[PDB]
Amino acid sequence: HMASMLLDTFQGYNAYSSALGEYAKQKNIDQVENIILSQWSFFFDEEQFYKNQWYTGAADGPVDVVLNEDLRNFANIEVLEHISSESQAIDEGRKVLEKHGLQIVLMDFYYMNSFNWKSLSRFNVTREHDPHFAVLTQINENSVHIIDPYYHHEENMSMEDFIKSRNSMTKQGKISFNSYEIFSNGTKKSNIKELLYYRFNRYLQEKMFGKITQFGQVVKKQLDNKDRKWAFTGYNCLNSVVYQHQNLINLQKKFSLEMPPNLQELLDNWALIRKKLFEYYSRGSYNTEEISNLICKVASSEEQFAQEVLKV
Ligand code: NI
Ligand code: NI
């Protein structure tokens, strides 16, 4: 685990958007960052909930397909998912690094050291096989250098561990050396007002606020206080929603946008939902009716907010 201070890597709103945005920043690719920072989305998969997979937040994953569509539609940027093999992945990395200097790779977070596993043991943290996105910067004789943009860490990983991480079965499915090529046959210029108008229109038309209500209604039905792991998953999933709210506050300041006056209050409500979910998971604090009521209140507040944003 890393000695130095944290890296000033692009946060985005999830691991995928973090990696795309950090890649775009380092390689001077315009549009990508603004398209990420203007995203406004919510999903809920009740099937994923009862499999205790990542069932809510800004976007399904690990690959953010809606973000890929936005990059194509707004900037004519195509993010191609390549698959490779145990015998080919490193040579293909060498070719990518010589041409581009960076390779975006799907990795099993289990093998990464952005989290100090030794020190976290004390706090009853488990080391899970979760998919994550890293940026490969260097291939050496027996090791590689990777950046973790989402967690603002970097490390030298053994060639053995790097290959293992990129060939691993995770809780969400199999990695086979997946990498992400950012391509344009002719980039297109988008604007902040267009990006927000399209996002907030889609949010209302697809009734994404309804998916918050669904999440809340499903929380209300968790009557078993002895099985709370869903609450930790929910806590982690909603980080993406907090990041979108903060990203929109930061867009408002940068571009002097007119916003409804309760954006910070909505962010605060999401932070409270996350606090109550974590403390419920951790030591059984609060109750599922209390948490459900708050999720259903924010659902209505988010519907109203999206309507008010589209008027201005
Ligand atoms: Ni650290
Ligand atoms: Ni800590």
Say which residue the tokens 């315009």 belong to. Answer: 30
Question: Which ligand is in closest contact with the Cα of 116?
Answer: 1
CA separation (Å) from 269 to 169, 239, 248, 274?
36, 13, 15, 9
Gap from CA of 257 to ligand 2 centroid (Å): 35
What gap in Å lies between CA 91 and CA 131, rounded to an integer? Answer: 23
What are 144's two structure tokens?
A: 């590689």
Question: Which ligand is in closest contact with the Cα of 117?
Answer: 1
CA pseudo-torsion sign 150, 174, 89, 79: negative
Question: Strands 179-183 and 78-82, how do they pair?
Answer: antiparallel
Gap from CA of 238 to ligand 2 centroid (Å): 18
Gap from CA of 174 to ligand 2 centroid (Å): 30
Contacts of residue 20, Cβ cutoff 8 Å, sequence gap at least 6: 12, 32, 36, 67, 71, 79, 104, 180, 182
Question: Which ligand is in closest contact with the Cα of 123?
Answer: 2
* Helices vs. strands in the chain: H and E counts, helices first: 13, 10
Gap from CA of 118 to ligand 2 centroid (Å): 12
The ranges assigned to domains in the chain are 15-30+78-183, 192-311
Gap from CA of 116 to ligand 2 centroid (Å): 9
Gap from CA of 281 to ligand 2 centroid (Å): 16
Element (H, E) at 145: strand 143-148
For residue 142, the one-letter residue type is: N
Gap from CA of 149 to ligand 1 centroid (Å): 12
What are 67's two structure tokens?
A: 């973000």
Question: Which ligand is in closest contact with the Cα of 120?
Answer: 2
Question: Which ligand is in closest contact with the Cα of 125?
Answer: 2
Taking a C-beta distance cutoff of 8 angstroms, is the pair 16, 35 a contact? Answer: no
Cis (ω within 30 of 0) for the bond into 62? yes
What are 149's two structure tokens?
A: 């943009």
Domain 15-30+78-183 sits in CATH 3.30.160: no
Taking a C-beta distance cutoff of 8 angstroms, is the pair 266, 302 a contact? Answer: yes
Q: Smallest Cα–Cα separation from 37: which of 63, 80, 74?
A: 74
Question: Which ligand is in closest contact with the Cα of 148?
Answer: 1
What are 259's two structure tokens?
A: 């916003």
Give me the helix-helix angle, 65-75 and 192-205, nearest 10°. 140
Gap from CA of 188 to ligand 1 centroid (Å): 38
Q: Quick one: CA torsion of 269, 273, 276, 281, rounded to 10 degrees?
A: -160
What are 154's two structure tokens?
A: 């970097």
What gap in Å lies between CA 106 and CA 165, rounded to an integer? Answer: 9
Gap from CA of 155 to ligand 2 centroid (Å): 19
Question: Which ligand is in closest contact with the Cα of 119?
Answer: 2
What gap in Å lies between CA 231 and CA 284, rounded to an integer? Answer: 10
For residue 97, the one-letter residue type is: L
Angle ∠(174,177,183) on CA atoms, nearest 5: 115
What gap in Å lies between CA 10 and CA 75, rounded to an integer? Answer: 19
